[model samples]
Target: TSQLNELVEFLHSPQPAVRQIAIDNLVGFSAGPTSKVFKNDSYRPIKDIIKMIMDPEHGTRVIIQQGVTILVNLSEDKLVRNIILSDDKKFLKFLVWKIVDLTNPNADIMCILLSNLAKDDGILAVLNIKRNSSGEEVDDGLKLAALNKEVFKSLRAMDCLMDCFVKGYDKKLTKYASFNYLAFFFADISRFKLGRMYFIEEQEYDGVVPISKLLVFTEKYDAKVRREGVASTIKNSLFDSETHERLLKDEKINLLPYILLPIASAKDSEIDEEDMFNLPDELQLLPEDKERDPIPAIICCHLESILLLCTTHAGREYLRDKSVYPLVRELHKNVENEDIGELCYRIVNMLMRGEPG
Candidate 1:
């Protein structure tokens, strides 16, 4: 225990190098086969590690980078996840706030840690937790000025998240900090009806709908994780069958093109006359080399979104009117993945067959 005590003392040393060295050792342990050593403060209360990361004095890029790396690694343990998610430390607010700073070398690292914690719906609900008027911990005069706007520096969690979600790899300072993991955060929180409502809130964030903004990535060539997360988010949103009309009819959203485009084969020239005739105006033709999103699960996500729309009669009417059938039929026959082909077949059955009597 003395060795552990010595390191904790060095963690608070006046010299940053000493602190970094201490953290380097902890960083090693944080990722080990014995990683559970840090579980429930197996070495010591990890409160110091948390405070070290949050402390402005340790705000240098290296410390923030290493510190977040440790937390993210440690959080792989579900028990450790509870420790980080524990509200007594108030880590959630700080993390949600910290992520808005795209320039921070560790900005997206915070997203990874959060992505892990929020995978549990328990933390997911608290993510969008409301403000407490009197219980607000006043940081300074600036806190109040920022508070008036809503939590997290005049940016609601959605505002910041939407920004990061949209900015992505192009917005990185350090290679390790690309905001791609925010995509999973989008998916993880998506399990909640509350979280799914985030997509429906459909007021424009920057003069454009967040829902439509993510669709272009459905066929994202360079990254499958991006494709899956964005597609899953949209799929989750489709659960609100009531919003099917708004999602499809809203010209700004014009949801059909993106959903079908991913499954649309560049080579599909054969189509039944009636089915082909029903194609959304934009989907009727092909771009020859147009790429399909490579991942099967994501293809199913888009297909599932189509079935989810079928939950409401109006959605079925709209989908039929636009000819989602032929597009999905093409996917059903040609898809290599059994999972993808089966889901596509299910949608075809739904669209082509009799409804429940």
Candidate 2:
């Protein structure tokens, strides 16, 4: 205990060299199997490490980066996640704020850490609530309340994230925090319902729908993580049967094409001329070597979105009215993976067989 306390004290030293050494040892200490010690041990080192990372005047980027690395490694363990979550100060909220702060050099690393913490939908539900932190109504739901004041009011970090990625990030707004890995965090939240609504319904930022900003990445092959993340996010959101029409009909959203285009093969001849005319223009023509999403799970997410839409009568009618069956049929003929083909077959079955009361 004395040894660890000494290291924590060195973290606060005037010498940058001492601070770096202390942080480096802490990083190794947290990653080592003995990190289980942090669960039952004195919490002073974790507290100090977080303070050092959050210190605005601390100019040593390398030291701050190492500090965040320790949290990222420790947060991988459940006990450390709780210890950090229950800090006297709200470290979870602080990390969310840090993520949207373009000037925060460690913001992307915070993205990695939050993604690990938010694996619990409990934390995500709390994080996505409405509040006046930046001018939205405060909402209380899901039974766990820690912040309930205008001063401590909660902001939907999801909303700010949409704004940042949608309008704020161009590699020019901030050189250090790209928010590129934020999709990993979003994907985690999207695995639950509240996170889906946060993306679908929040309209507070930039006058653009949050999901609309993310959906475009479905065809972005260069960034596979972003593409798959958006696909999984969209797939989860589609489970809300109530939003089927708005997703399909919204001009700004135009969600169907993003689902179809990714799994679509290069040739459309199997699709009829009439059906071809109704398809999204991009899906109408084919370059011979054009690829499907290439990752089967993402392709399954795309198919699962189709299957989700099939669960509702409105969705069935929408698919039928839009002539979606031909594309699904054509896709099933060419898919190479068994699981993907099974998903395609299920969606195609829905497209072919009419729903009943």
Candidate 3:
């Protein structure tokens, strides 16, 4: 107990070096086998860690990075997640406000931490309304927005992310990382009926659905962002039947070609073994079967999106046309990845045989 008290005191020290050491030790301590001891055994230090995240005195970039890392690690613990959520969601709102305040140098890190917190299963449970004894939901369906509509209104998270990637930020990798987390946030929330309607029918940061911007991201230079942006955009559309119908049937929208192009244009490039050795340790040590090529995986995702659309009568009629079937067959012929090849075959089989092949 004395040791724990000393560390907590170090966390509040005026010396940056002492604070860094304290947080580093805290991270290792929280992850070690003794982590559960702190759940009830050491609540003050844990609570202080959350409060210290945006502490004015620790505004240095290095301190902010260390602070966010500690929160992220702590948030991984179910006990810690519930503790923060238990406080009427005050800490969650503070994190949101930190991201909303662009002047905060740690905004990017806060965004990542917020994503981590949001993805926590405990937090997800809280965001979802509970059922009554009668099996009926007790609260308005807009539980997420109701919890914090200010987050969307003040930060304009969608707009901030779109602009960050498109307009180009100094920190390319940081912006890309944050973009991934925010995309995940949207994808998670969009799973519910109310969440989908909120974004589709009510929410408007830039006054449009933001599909065109997402489409532009499909061709981004960064492979991860390109994959994530497209996947998130497609996932958001899947829950809304009205948008799904409109997307497939509206000829002027013409989204299918863009979706299918990735599948069609994927080509296996020759790798130089000498250059391969120069790559990072992780890349160099990758097994032959688990190669780094994202196209095959991306192609499969696009195919899944197409399959979802094919569920509707309008989508079936649109896909069954002569103009589209040949393209599916052509992609199936050239695709090297087994999963993608099978998906293409299934698409072709469904189109030609009128059922699963």
Candidate 4:
């Protein structure tokens, strides 16, 4: 008890060094239900430890940063988050705001903070919207512009934040932070269905890069995003020839390989034996005895047509005029291979009958 009193006193101490000692001590005292202890009246001496960490005279920027690190871990405490976020004074919000506002042209502390802040449900909730007295929700249209104002502020103060994370070639902290952002961005984008709708409404064609960004991060290890991204690409018709040709041709985003890799070896004993020959000669003629299917190949053909249509107005015209008919006709031919024939027949059916394939 005596030790607890001393620790809390140190936490409240006016002197900066003494306060650091108190915070440091409390930070390490992992005993007797540490999560509950911090919130208990039993730990009274730890009074407003977070508030003290914000004191201007004693609160060096480094101390505040360390405080942020501590708070991030503690943020998982729903009770703690509620207490901090409920404060009308918006102290927690201000702290995060300041951190994200550290835009110095050289370093993007704000970017780092925004990345981390987004991880905090409270912070992200604050950034989203609030219900007004009239029951209509209020939003931070201009004020919540993180990319513009917040990004610039953090970049402006880059030098100060840089000292801790990016001192010389030491990238230990920077890598950690950037990777966190990459993940955070992914989670945010994944659940952000409304944002996608807004883009569609605005007709912004910037979808290419964001999809690529998601692909780049997860292509090596994560399968969910890769699969979802491919699905989303097809779903949004982003790969339609008229819309996606430049991205595919110029940017070389060969989405078909990914689309085809999984379906190539699909098995279906029920398919008519005659339907088998329509498959690509590589599948049939390759002496590797590789089991293959036509569904993926046929999907590839439609994907190609979509890509062509998206690539140019001419491509769209071609689909509406000549490409669609001929492709349908080619796909209908049974002489090529059974899988290909079935797939082509399905595509033709979908195009003509407008049925779900």
Candidate 5:
């Protein structure tokens, strides 16, 4: 215990190197088999760690960076997560503030930690838990804890992700992390009532529009990231009926060309016969040895959603105006995916018959 006390004192040292060494040692301890040793007995040290992170007078970049690393490691313990989430709106709010700063080198780690806590199936179910609702508790404790106002603020998580997406769209590393986070973020948010509300809300921030960015990523070179962007757009736009109207009313944007690029890219001439369903080599996905290709399937499903959009007269005429039939016809013949091939044929039939979009 004295040794632990000494390390905590080192965290408050005047020298940045001393503080960094303290953090590194603490992180090593947190990662070990007995890492949860202090989770129950001492939350003061945890609170002090957070205080050091936000200490403007003493907080150098190195101290905050190391502090964030320790937080990430400690956050894995359920007890520690509860300690942070307990009653103190201040801690969660500060975390959100840090996450919003795109310039912070440790922002990505904070984003990951925030996402980890928001991973509850019942988060959405209890969004509107009225004052008089039945006292039945859901099996997942995280979901119940997530119902608090401060905890749910994690919903604004999209803003941090949006900042990265819009500001760093041109940078390869930022684009990769931003979109990957969106993929998981959206997938989780889509499950809750409030989360879906976020998607249906106006899709712009400081004049930077997400629809435009999604259009660009649909055709980007990184297959995995491109796949994630396309999936995110489809998830937010197509699954929710309100999104379609929101998109249609936005006069400045054109959804067809963006939607068509993926379908068009699947053409036989565009890719070799063997590599048709495989992801590009540059993309590093899980299970390094396996060829977990989902992009082709996601694009196919996106086409189906586009077909649904085309059922509306405005959507159909837009395709007709864009002269999309030839491309659709070509896609019908060239796409190797059977479902996509069938969708192309269906779309062509609709176009030829002058069917309502």
Candidate 6:
């Protein structure tokens, strides 16, 4: 016990050996304050940690993995988790990618890191990696690749993180408090990928990606992150006119019909009890959540934002030059058809009348 106290004291020590020793001692412990160092204490030289682990001479990668393995358990708190998901663009974008590159070896460490990081709004954070010291763009598909690598490698870690939820009758993991992080992580990555790809290029595609990703998880299909990725690929096709019509050639296109189905036609149980909303109020709601219930209305808002992307003067100019205006216009019309319209209207009515308030 006295030795443990001495070790804890050395954690903040200036000497590199003392700090490394302290870090080794703290690895894989279940206690709260020990984990707090990673969460609340001063930042560690993450790049060095990654290098040391990968270094052949000192090769402490496995040791580092065991020490930092508790992130999955520690992710229950948002305040302490700034390490993975923060407002700083450097931390959000490059840091996560860097960590994934370093820790890709062992599943436990990789999974816990990704699973926990996935719980936060990393997409919003990733938005910050605007430019490097050289003012050049970061690597392409970096975020998606990082996200995919972690999710595919650590299903058990994901299972553990998601297990914290109650599995609400709504059938969405997001509606349940524990699983919402998983949902948000899944949805946000998609939003970042699709939104940035379309908007970043022409800035025409906007909220469509974020909202479309949310809509895809409506299916009862497998709940893993890679499976959700299928939705992202298909959504990309929808945003591109030439690709939208041609996407049916891909086997994944088979899933689109389910997402495109009219809300009224869906079984009452299958449709979100609050059709407009992804999860109930328990999860953190974005500013858009202030509107009203049956969350489908918000989905309608996303649909409109997507349409405006193509219809606005600048957007139309983009479409006109691409020669995809007619195809885009047709897609816009189809996306806003009676299915989304009816539910959107009902949800809007509920908001105006203040139903179930």
Q: Largest TM-score belongs to which candidate?
A: 1
The residue-by-residue lDDT of candidate 3 on 232-330, one tens digit each, is 556566654457766654444456655654443323323356643442232334434432225666667777776666665566666664245554565
Q: RMSD to native for every prediction?
A: 4.5, 6.1, 11.4, 12.6, 11.9, 14.4
Of 2 and 5, the candidate ranking higher by TM-score: 2
Q: What is the lDDT of residue 62 in candidate 6?
A: 51
Q: Can you give the lDDT of residue 196 in candidate 3?
A: 52
Clashes of 3: 0
Estimate, for each residue in 1-357, the C-alpha lDDT of model 1 and write its tens digit.
225545655665777677778887767666766455454434343555676677665556777777788888887777677767773445676666567544456776788888888777666644454334422344421121133233223235665566666655654333445678778888878778777776666544355666777877776677677888888888887887778888888988878888888888767535778877778777766677875676787788888888898876677888888878877777776767888878877787777754556
* Predicted structure 1, TM vs. truth: 0.83
lDDT for residue 99 in candidate 5, whole number 0-100: 51
Question: Against the hidden reference, what TM-scores do the models get?
Answer: 0.83, 0.82, 0.66, 0.42, 0.56, 0.38
Using lDDT as the yardstick, the better of models 4 and 6 is 4
Sort every candidate by TM-score, greatest first. Answer: 1, 2, 3, 5, 4, 6
Model 3 spans > 4 angstroms off? 1-21, 28-44, 57-60, 85-88, 120-180, 240-242, 249-254, 266-293, 321-324, 353-357
Candidate 3 global lDDT: 0.53
Instruction: State each model's CA lDDT, in order.
Output: 0.69, 0.69, 0.53, 0.39, 0.54, 0.37
Score candidate 2 by lDDT: 0.69
In the range 221-321, model 4's lDDT, one tens digit per residue, is 23332233333433353423334444443333443333333333323223334444543332343334333223344345444434434345443433333
Which regions of candidate 4 are displaced past 4 Å?
1-6, 30-32, 41-49, 52-57, 88-121, 125-182, 185-212, 220-357
